[PDB]
Amino acid sequence: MNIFEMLRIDEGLRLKIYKDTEGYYTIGIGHLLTKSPSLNAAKSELDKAIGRNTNGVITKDEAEKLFNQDVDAAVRGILRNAKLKPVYDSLDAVRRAAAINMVFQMGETGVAGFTNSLRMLQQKRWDEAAVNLAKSRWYNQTPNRAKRVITTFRTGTWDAYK
Ligand SMILES: CCCCc1ccccc1
Ligand SMILES: [Cl-]
Ligand SMILES: [Cl-]
């Protein structure tokens, strides 16, 4: 298992524009297009991302290309964040995948506002962090996904995904 497979499981793959759990226009493997309610704006953002007149539909290859770029941007966002970087550097490989997952889902901003959990993870207080991470809107809105990521941080294994 790895980050890509993990995210592919959590986000699914859709080749036509769709609304995410928050109701935002998305495509592919969790690639958010726009928070705007307008489908046209979403179609415009899509064509600009792909480099062609898509008409709201993309191929599997195109989806995977966006996905690769988004994973890379997520990591890079982490490494560029002064609050996040040190925590991430302190984690083992599996737990780093859990960190990427969260940033991919909620943005560096989102995740950067979990100070208490960050400190706990940095200290390797797994069970405590796990409890703290669950006291969040994120957990209450997407509990099954949050549970899988939380178990990953708690155990340092891919069990939740097997
Ligand atoms: C809980 C804080 C957000 C997830 C995260 C953890 C460590 C490093 C980067 C990102
Ligand atoms: Cl893009
Ligand atoms: Cl869920």
Short mmCIF file of N, CA, C and O in Angstrom, two decimals, residues 26-148:
data_model
loop_
_atom_site.label_atom_id
_atom_site.label_comp_id
_atom_site.label_asym_id
_atom_site.label_seq_id
_atom_site.Cartn_x
_atom_site.Cartn_y
_atom_site.Cartn_z
N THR A 26 -16.06 18.87 -8.46
CA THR A 26 -14.83 18.11 -8.41
C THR A 26 -14.82 17.20 -9.60
O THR A 26 -15.87 16.98 -10.19
N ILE A 27 -13.65 16.61 -9.90
CA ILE A 27 -13.53 15.62 -10.96
C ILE A 27 -12.36 14.68 -10.64
O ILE A 27 -11.48 15.04 -9.86
N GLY A 28 -12.32 13.52 -11.27
CA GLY A 28 -11.18 12.65 -11.17
C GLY A 28 -11.05 12.00 -9.85
O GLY A 28 -12.00 11.43 -9.36
N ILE A 29 -9.85 12.07 -9.30
CA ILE A 29 -9.59 11.50 -7.99
C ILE A 29 -9.53 12.61 -6.93
O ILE A 29 -8.49 13.00 -6.44
N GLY A 30 -10.71 13.12 -6.61
CA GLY A 30 -10.81 14.15 -5.61
C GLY A 30 -10.23 15.47 -6.01
O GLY A 30 -9.90 16.26 -5.14
N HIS A 31 -10.14 15.76 -7.31
CA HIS A 31 -9.59 17.06 -7.70
C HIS A 31 -10.66 18.17 -7.66
O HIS A 31 -11.51 18.29 -8.56
N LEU A 32 -10.60 19.00 -6.63
CA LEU A 32 -11.55 20.09 -6.49
C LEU A 32 -11.42 21.11 -7.60
O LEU A 32 -10.34 21.56 -7.93
N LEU A 33 -12.49 21.48 -8.21
CA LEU A 33 -12.37 22.43 -9.29
C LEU A 33 -12.60 23.87 -8.85
O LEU A 33 -11.88 24.79 -9.25
N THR A 34 -13.67 24.07 -8.10
CA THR A 34 -14.08 25.38 -7.65
C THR A 34 -15.10 25.26 -6.54
O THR A 34 -15.88 24.30 -6.52
N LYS A 35 -15.11 26.24 -5.65
CA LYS A 35 -16.09 26.25 -4.58
C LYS A 35 -17.31 27.01 -5.03
O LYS A 35 -18.30 27.13 -4.34
N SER A 36 -17.25 27.51 -6.24
CA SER A 36 -18.39 28.24 -6.75
C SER A 36 -19.48 27.32 -7.25
O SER A 36 -19.25 26.23 -7.78
N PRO A 37 -20.70 27.80 -7.06
CA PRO A 37 -21.94 27.10 -7.39
C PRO A 37 -22.22 26.96 -8.86
O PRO A 37 -23.13 26.23 -9.30
N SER A 38 -21.42 27.67 -9.62
CA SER A 38 -21.59 27.67 -11.06
C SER A 38 -20.86 26.57 -11.78
O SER A 38 -19.63 26.46 -11.72
N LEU A 39 -21.64 25.83 -12.54
CA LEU A 39 -21.11 24.73 -13.30
C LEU A 39 -20.22 25.21 -14.44
O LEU A 39 -19.28 24.55 -14.90
N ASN A 40 -20.52 26.39 -14.92
CA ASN A 40 -19.73 26.92 -15.98
C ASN A 40 -18.37 27.27 -15.46
O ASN A 40 -17.38 27.05 -16.13
N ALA A 41 -18.32 27.85 -14.28
CA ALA A 41 -17.04 28.18 -13.74
C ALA A 41 -16.24 26.92 -13.55
O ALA A 41 -15.06 26.90 -13.77
N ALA A 42 -16.91 25.85 -13.15
CA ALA A 42 -16.24 24.58 -12.97
C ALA A 42 -15.74 24.04 -14.28
O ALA A 42 -14.64 23.48 -14.36
N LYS A 43 -16.55 24.19 -15.33
CA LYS A 43 -16.12 23.70 -16.64
C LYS A 43 -14.94 24.50 -17.16
O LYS A 43 -14.06 23.98 -17.80
N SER A 44 -14.91 25.76 -16.81
CA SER A 44 -13.83 26.62 -17.24
C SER A 44 -12.52 26.25 -16.53
O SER A 44 -11.45 26.14 -17.11
N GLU A 45 -12.64 26.03 -15.23
CA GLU A 45 -11.50 25.61 -14.44
C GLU A 45 -11.02 24.25 -14.92
O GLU A 45 -9.83 24.00 -15.02
N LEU A 46 -11.95 23.37 -15.28
CA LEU A 46 -11.52 22.09 -15.79
C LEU A 46 -10.71 22.18 -17.10
O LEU A 46 -9.68 21.56 -17.32
N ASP A 47 -11.19 22.98 -18.03
CA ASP A 47 -10.50 23.06 -19.29
C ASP A 47 -9.14 23.66 -19.13
O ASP A 47 -8.19 23.26 -19.82
N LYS A 48 -9.06 24.63 -18.24
CA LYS A 48 -7.78 25.30 -17.94
C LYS A 48 -6.78 24.30 -17.27
O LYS A 48 -5.59 24.30 -17.50
N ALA A 49 -7.30 23.38 -16.46
CA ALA A 49 -6.44 22.41 -15.80
C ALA A 49 -5.91 21.37 -16.76
O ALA A 49 -4.79 20.93 -16.61
N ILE A 50 -6.75 20.98 -17.72
CA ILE A 50 -6.45 19.93 -18.69
C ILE A 50 -5.76 20.41 -19.95
O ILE A 50 -5.05 19.68 -20.65
N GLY A 51 -6.05 21.63 -20.30
CA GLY A 51 -5.45 22.15 -21.52
C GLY A 51 -6.26 21.83 -22.78
O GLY A 51 -5.70 21.73 -23.87
N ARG A 52 -7.57 21.65 -22.65
CA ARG A 52 -8.40 21.39 -23.81
C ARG A 52 -9.83 21.63 -23.44
O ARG A 52 -10.16 21.81 -22.27
N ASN A 53 -10.64 21.64 -24.47
CA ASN A 53 -12.07 21.82 -24.33
C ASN A 53 -12.63 20.48 -23.99
O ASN A 53 -12.73 19.61 -24.85
N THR A 54 -12.89 20.28 -22.70
CA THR A 54 -13.30 18.97 -22.21
C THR A 54 -14.77 18.73 -22.23
O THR A 54 -15.18 17.57 -22.29
N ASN A 55 -15.55 19.78 -22.06
CA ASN A 55 -16.97 19.54 -21.99
C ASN A 55 -17.37 18.72 -20.72
O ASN A 55 -18.34 17.94 -20.73
N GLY A 56 -16.62 18.91 -19.62
CA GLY A 56 -16.92 18.26 -18.32
C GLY A 56 -16.57 16.80 -18.21
O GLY A 56 -16.90 16.16 -17.23
N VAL A 57 -15.92 16.29 -19.24
CA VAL A 57 -15.50 14.89 -19.22
C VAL A 57 -14.02 14.74 -19.51
O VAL A 57 -13.46 15.43 -20.37
N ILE A 58 -13.36 13.84 -18.79
CA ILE A 58 -11.92 13.62 -18.95
C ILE A 58 -11.63 12.15 -19.00
O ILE A 58 -12.50 11.35 -18.64
N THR A 59 -10.43 11.81 -19.46
CA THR A 59 -10.07 10.42 -19.57
C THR A 59 -9.40 9.99 -18.28
O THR A 59 -9.03 10.84 -17.48
N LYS A 60 -9.19 8.69 -18.13
CA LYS A 60 -8.53 8.07 -16.99
C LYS A 60 -7.09 8.56 -16.84
O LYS A 60 -6.60 8.88 -15.75
N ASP A 61 -6.42 8.67 -17.99
CA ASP A 61 -5.07 9.20 -18.03
C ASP A 61 -5.00 10.65 -17.48
O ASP A 61 -4.11 11.03 -16.72
N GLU A 62 -5.95 11.47 -17.93
CA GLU A 62 -6.00 12.85 -17.51
C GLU A 62 -6.27 12.91 -16.00
O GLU A 62 -5.67 13.69 -15.30
N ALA A 63 -7.19 12.06 -15.53
CA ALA A 63 -7.49 12.00 -14.10
C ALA A 63 -6.23 11.67 -13.31
O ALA A 63 -5.94 12.31 -12.29
N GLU A 64 -5.49 10.65 -13.78
CA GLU A 64 -4.27 10.27 -13.10
C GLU A 64 -3.21 11.32 -13.15
O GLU A 64 -2.47 11.49 -12.19
N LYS A 65 -3.18 12.07 -14.23
CA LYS A 65 -2.19 13.16 -14.28
C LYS A 65 -2.50 14.25 -13.23
O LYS A 65 -1.62 14.69 -12.47
N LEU A 66 -3.77 14.65 -13.12
CA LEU A 66 -4.17 15.63 -12.09
C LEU A 66 -3.83 15.07 -10.72
O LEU A 66 -3.38 15.80 -9.84
N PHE A 67 -4.10 13.80 -10.55
CA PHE A 67 -3.86 13.15 -9.25
C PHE A 67 -2.40 13.23 -8.87
O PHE A 67 -2.04 13.61 -7.75
N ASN A 68 -1.53 12.87 -9.79
CA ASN A 68 -0.10 12.98 -9.54
C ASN A 68 0.30 14.40 -9.16
O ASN A 68 1.09 14.71 -8.25
N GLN A 69 -0.25 15.35 -9.89
CA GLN A 69 0.11 16.68 -9.56
C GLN A 69 -0.38 17.09 -8.20
O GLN A 69 0.25 17.89 -7.53
N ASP A 70 -1.58 16.65 -7.82
CA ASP A 70 -2.16 17.05 -6.55
C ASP A 70 -1.43 16.42 -5.38
O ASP A 70 -1.31 17.05 -4.35
N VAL A 71 -0.95 15.19 -5.54
CA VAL A 71 -0.21 14.55 -4.44
C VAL A 71 1.08 15.29 -4.23
O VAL A 71 1.47 15.69 -3.13
N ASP A 72 1.73 15.56 -5.33
CA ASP A 72 2.97 16.31 -5.27
C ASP A 72 2.79 17.69 -4.62
O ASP A 72 3.56 18.14 -3.77
N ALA A 73 1.74 18.40 -4.98
CA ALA A 73 1.49 19.69 -4.39
C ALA A 73 1.21 19.57 -2.91
O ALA A 73 1.58 20.43 -2.11
N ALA A 74 0.55 18.51 -2.53
CA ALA A 74 0.24 18.33 -1.12
C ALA A 74 1.52 18.19 -0.30
O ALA A 74 1.70 18.82 0.76
N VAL A 75 2.39 17.32 -0.80
CA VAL A 75 3.63 17.11 -0.09
C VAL A 75 4.40 18.41 -0.01
O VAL A 75 4.93 18.82 1.04
N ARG A 76 4.48 19.06 -1.15
CA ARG A 76 5.24 20.26 -1.19
C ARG A 76 4.70 21.34 -0.25
O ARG A 76 5.41 22.14 0.39
N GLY A 77 3.39 21.32 -0.09
CA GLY A 77 2.72 22.24 0.82
C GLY A 77 3.14 21.95 2.26
O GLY A 77 3.41 22.80 3.07
N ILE A 78 3.19 20.68 2.56
CA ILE A 78 3.61 20.29 3.86
C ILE A 78 5.04 20.77 4.12
O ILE A 78 5.36 21.41 5.12
N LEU A 79 5.93 20.45 3.19
CA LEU A 79 7.32 20.79 3.40
C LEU A 79 7.56 22.28 3.46
O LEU A 79 8.55 22.70 4.01
N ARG A 80 6.66 23.05 2.88
CA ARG A 80 6.81 24.50 2.89
C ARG A 80 6.19 25.15 4.13
O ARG A 80 6.35 26.34 4.32
N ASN A 81 5.41 24.41 4.90
CA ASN A 81 4.76 24.96 6.07
C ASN A 81 5.61 24.79 7.32
O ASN A 81 6.05 23.69 7.69
N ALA A 82 5.89 25.92 7.94
CA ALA A 82 6.74 25.90 9.11
C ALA A 82 6.10 25.18 10.27
O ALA A 82 6.78 24.66 11.14
N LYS A 83 4.79 25.13 10.31
CA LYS A 83 4.14 24.42 11.39
C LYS A 83 4.09 22.93 11.07
O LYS A 83 4.20 22.06 11.91
N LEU A 84 3.89 22.61 9.83
CA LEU A 84 3.74 21.21 9.48
C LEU A 84 5.01 20.43 9.28
O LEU A 84 5.10 19.26 9.63
N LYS A 85 5.97 21.05 8.64
CA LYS A 85 7.18 20.34 8.31
C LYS A 85 7.86 19.54 9.42
O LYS A 85 8.23 18.37 9.28
N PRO A 86 8.06 20.18 10.54
CA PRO A 86 8.76 19.51 11.61
C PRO A 86 8.01 18.30 12.11
O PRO A 86 8.62 17.31 12.48
N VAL A 87 6.68 18.37 12.09
CA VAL A 87 5.91 17.22 12.51
C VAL A 87 6.06 16.07 11.52
O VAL A 87 6.23 14.91 11.83
N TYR A 88 5.95 16.43 10.28
CA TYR A 88 6.00 15.46 9.23
C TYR A 88 7.35 14.77 9.23
O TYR A 88 7.44 13.56 9.02
N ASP A 89 8.41 15.55 9.46
CA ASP A 89 9.78 14.97 9.47
C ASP A 89 9.96 14.00 10.59
O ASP A 89 10.76 13.09 10.50
N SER A 90 9.19 14.21 11.64
CA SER A 90 9.29 13.33 12.79
C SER A 90 8.58 11.99 12.63
O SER A 90 8.79 11.03 13.38
N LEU A 91 7.68 11.90 11.65
CA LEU A 91 6.89 10.66 11.45
C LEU A 91 7.57 9.60 10.61
O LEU A 91 8.42 9.92 9.76
N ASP A 92 7.10 8.35 10.83
CA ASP A 92 7.52 7.21 10.01
C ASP A 92 6.75 7.27 8.69
O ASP A 92 5.81 8.08 8.52
N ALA A 93 7.15 6.42 7.74
CA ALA A 93 6.58 6.41 6.40
C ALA A 93 5.06 6.25 6.30
O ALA A 93 4.42 6.93 5.48
N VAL A 94 4.48 5.35 7.09
CA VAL A 94 3.05 5.12 7.03
C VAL A 94 2.32 6.32 7.56
O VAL A 94 1.37 6.85 6.97
N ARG A 95 2.78 6.81 8.70
CA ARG A 95 2.07 7.96 9.25
C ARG A 95 2.20 9.18 8.38
O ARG A 95 1.33 10.00 8.33
N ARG A 96 3.31 9.30 7.67
CA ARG A 96 3.43 10.41 6.74
C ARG A 96 2.34 10.32 5.67
O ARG A 96 1.86 11.33 5.20
N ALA A 97 1.95 9.10 5.29
CA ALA A 97 0.92 8.98 4.27
C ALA A 97 -0.39 9.51 4.82
O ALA A 97 -1.15 10.18 4.13
N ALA A 98 -0.64 9.25 6.09
CA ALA A 98 -1.87 9.75 6.73
C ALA A 98 -1.87 11.29 6.74
O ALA A 98 -2.92 11.94 6.52
N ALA A 99 -0.70 11.90 7.00
CA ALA A 99 -0.59 13.35 7.00
C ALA A 99 -0.88 13.91 5.61
O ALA A 99 -1.59 14.93 5.45
N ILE A 100 -0.35 13.25 4.59
CA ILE A 100 -0.60 13.73 3.24
C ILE A 100 -2.11 13.66 2.92
O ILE A 100 -2.72 14.57 2.33
N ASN A 101 -2.72 12.55 3.34
CA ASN A 101 -4.14 12.36 3.09
C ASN A 101 -4.96 13.51 3.60
O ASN A 101 -5.83 14.06 2.89
N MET A 102 -4.68 13.89 4.84
CA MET A 102 -5.42 14.99 5.43
C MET A 102 -5.23 16.30 4.68
O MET A 102 -6.17 17.03 4.49
N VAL A 103 -3.98 16.58 4.33
CA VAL A 103 -3.71 17.84 3.63
C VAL A 103 -4.36 17.80 2.27
O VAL A 103 -4.87 18.79 1.83
N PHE A 104 -4.37 16.65 1.64
CA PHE A 104 -5.00 16.54 0.34
C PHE A 104 -6.48 16.81 0.45
O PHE A 104 -7.07 17.46 -0.38
N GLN A 105 -7.10 16.36 1.52
CA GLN A 105 -8.51 16.54 1.67
C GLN A 105 -8.93 17.95 2.06
O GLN A 105 -9.96 18.49 1.62
N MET A 106 -8.19 18.54 2.97
CA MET A 106 -8.57 19.79 3.58
C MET A 106 -7.67 20.99 3.41
O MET A 106 -7.95 22.08 3.89
N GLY A 107 -6.59 20.82 2.70
CA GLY A 107 -5.70 21.94 2.50
C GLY A 107 -4.85 22.18 3.72
O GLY A 107 -5.19 21.79 4.83
N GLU A 108 -3.71 22.81 3.44
CA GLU A 108 -2.66 23.10 4.41
C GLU A 108 -3.12 24.01 5.50
O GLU A 108 -2.64 23.99 6.64
N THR A 109 -4.11 24.78 5.12
CA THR A 109 -4.76 25.67 6.03
C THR A 109 -5.56 24.86 7.04
O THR A 109 -5.35 24.95 8.26
N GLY A 110 -6.46 24.01 6.47
CA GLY A 110 -7.32 23.12 7.24
C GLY A 110 -6.49 22.44 8.32
O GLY A 110 -6.62 22.74 9.50
N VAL A 111 -5.62 21.56 7.86
CA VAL A 111 -4.75 20.80 8.73
C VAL A 111 -3.86 21.64 9.64
O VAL A 111 -3.62 21.28 10.79
N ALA A 112 -3.36 22.76 9.14
CA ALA A 112 -2.52 23.58 10.00
C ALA A 112 -3.26 24.11 11.27
O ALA A 112 -2.60 24.46 12.25
N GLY A 113 -4.63 24.09 11.29
CA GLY A 113 -5.42 24.55 12.47
C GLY A 113 -5.80 23.51 13.57
O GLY A 113 -6.76 23.71 14.34
N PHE A 114 -5.00 22.43 13.64
CA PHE A 114 -5.12 21.30 14.52
C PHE A 114 -3.87 21.27 15.38
O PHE A 114 -3.19 20.27 15.49
N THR A 115 -3.56 22.38 15.96
CA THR A 115 -2.39 22.54 16.77
C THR A 115 -2.16 21.52 17.83
O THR A 115 -1.07 21.04 18.00
N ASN A 116 -3.17 21.31 18.63
CA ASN A 116 -3.05 20.32 19.68
C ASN A 116 -2.73 18.91 19.17
O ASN A 116 -1.86 18.21 19.71
N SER A 117 -3.41 18.48 18.11
CA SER A 117 -3.13 17.16 17.55
C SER A 117 -1.70 17.11 17.00
O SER A 117 -1.04 16.08 17.08
N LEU A 118 -1.25 18.22 16.40
CA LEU A 118 0.09 18.28 15.84
C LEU A 118 1.12 18.02 16.90
O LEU A 118 2.02 17.19 16.74
N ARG A 119 0.96 18.71 18.00
CA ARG A 119 1.91 18.57 19.10
C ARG A 119 1.95 17.14 19.62
O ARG A 119 3.03 16.57 19.89
N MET A 120 0.74 16.53 19.72
CA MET A 120 0.64 15.17 20.20
C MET A 120 1.28 14.21 19.21
O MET A 120 1.92 13.25 19.57
N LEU A 121 1.09 14.44 17.94
CA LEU A 121 1.71 13.52 17.02
C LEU A 121 3.24 13.68 17.11
O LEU A 121 4.01 12.71 17.03
N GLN A 122 3.68 14.94 17.24
CA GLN A 122 5.10 15.18 17.29
C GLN A 122 5.66 14.44 18.49
O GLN A 122 6.78 13.93 18.50
N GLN A 123 4.88 14.36 19.55
CA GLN A 123 5.38 13.68 20.72
C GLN A 123 5.18 12.21 20.68
O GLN A 123 5.54 11.58 21.66
N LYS A 124 4.56 11.65 19.61
CA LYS A 124 4.32 10.20 19.52
C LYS A 124 3.35 9.66 20.56
O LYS A 124 3.39 8.49 20.93
N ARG A 125 2.43 10.50 20.97
CA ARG A 125 1.34 10.09 21.91
C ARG A 125 0.14 9.70 21.02
O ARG A 125 -0.84 10.45 20.83
N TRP A 126 0.27 8.53 20.40
CA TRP A 126 -0.69 8.06 19.43
C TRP A 126 -2.14 7.98 19.85
O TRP A 126 -3.05 8.44 19.16
N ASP A 127 -2.40 7.32 20.95
CA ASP A 127 -3.77 7.19 21.37
C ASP A 127 -4.38 8.53 21.71
O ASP A 127 -5.52 8.82 21.36
N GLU A 128 -3.59 9.40 22.36
CA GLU A 128 -4.10 10.70 22.70
C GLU A 128 -4.41 11.53 21.46
O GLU A 128 -5.40 12.28 21.36
N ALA A 129 -3.50 11.47 20.50
CA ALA A 129 -3.75 12.24 19.29
C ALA A 129 -5.02 11.77 18.59
O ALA A 129 -5.81 12.54 18.04
N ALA A 130 -5.17 10.46 18.59
CA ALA A 130 -6.30 9.83 17.94
C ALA A 130 -7.59 10.34 18.54
O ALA A 130 -8.54 10.65 17.85
N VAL A 131 -7.63 10.47 19.83
CA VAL A 131 -8.81 10.98 20.44
C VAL A 131 -9.03 12.44 20.09
O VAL A 131 -10.12 12.89 19.80
N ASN A 132 -7.96 13.22 20.16
CA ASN A 132 -8.07 14.62 19.84
C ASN A 132 -8.50 14.84 18.38
O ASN A 132 -9.31 15.68 18.04
N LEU A 133 -7.92 14.07 17.47
CA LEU A 133 -8.27 14.24 16.05
C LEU A 133 -9.78 14.02 15.82
O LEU A 133 -10.37 14.56 14.87
N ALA A 134 -10.40 13.15 16.62
CA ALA A 134 -11.84 12.84 16.42
C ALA A 134 -12.79 13.96 16.86
O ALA A 134 -13.98 14.00 16.49
N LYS A 135 -12.28 14.88 17.67
CA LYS A 135 -13.10 15.99 18.12
C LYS A 135 -13.00 17.09 17.09
O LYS A 135 -12.32 18.11 17.29
N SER A 136 -13.59 16.84 15.94
CA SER A 136 -13.45 17.79 14.86
C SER A 136 -14.63 17.70 13.91
O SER A 136 -15.31 16.65 13.80
N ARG A 137 -14.85 18.81 13.20
CA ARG A 137 -15.91 18.78 12.22
C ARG A 137 -15.61 17.70 11.17
O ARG A 137 -16.48 16.97 10.71
N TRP A 138 -14.32 17.61 10.80
CA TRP A 138 -13.84 16.64 9.79
C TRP A 138 -14.33 15.24 10.14
O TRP A 138 -14.92 14.53 9.33
N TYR A 139 -14.13 14.85 11.41
CA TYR A 139 -14.54 13.53 11.82
C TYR A 139 -16.04 13.39 11.76
O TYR A 139 -16.56 12.35 11.36
N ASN A 140 -16.74 14.43 12.22
CA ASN A 140 -18.22 14.36 12.23
C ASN A 140 -18.82 14.36 10.84
O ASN A 140 -19.88 13.79 10.64
N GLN A 141 -18.18 15.02 9.86
CA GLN A 141 -18.70 15.06 8.50
C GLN A 141 -18.37 13.84 7.65
O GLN A 141 -19.20 13.43 6.84
N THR A 142 -17.17 13.30 7.79
CA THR A 142 -16.77 12.13 7.01
C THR A 142 -16.13 11.18 7.96
O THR A 142 -14.94 10.95 7.98
N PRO A 143 -16.96 10.62 8.81
CA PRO A 143 -16.50 9.70 9.85
C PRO A 143 -15.78 8.43 9.35
O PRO A 143 -14.80 7.96 9.94
N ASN A 144 -16.26 7.81 8.26
CA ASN A 144 -15.60 6.56 7.85
C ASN A 144 -14.19 6.78 7.34
O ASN A 144 -13.27 6.02 7.60
N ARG A 145 -14.04 7.86 6.58
CA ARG A 145 -12.73 8.21 6.07
C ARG A 145 -11.83 8.68 7.23
O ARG A 145 -10.68 8.27 7.36
N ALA A 146 -12.37 9.55 8.10
CA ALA A 146 -11.60 10.05 9.23
C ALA A 146 -11.13 8.87 10.09
O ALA A 146 -9.98 8.85 10.52
N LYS A 147 -12.02 7.89 10.35
CA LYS A 147 -11.65 6.71 11.15
C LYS A 147 -10.45 5.96 10.54
O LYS A 147 -9.56 5.49 11.28
N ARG A 148 -10.44 5.84 9.20
CA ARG A 148 -9.33 5.11 8.53
C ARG A 148 -8.01 5.88 8.70
O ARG A 148 -6.98 5.29 8.95
#
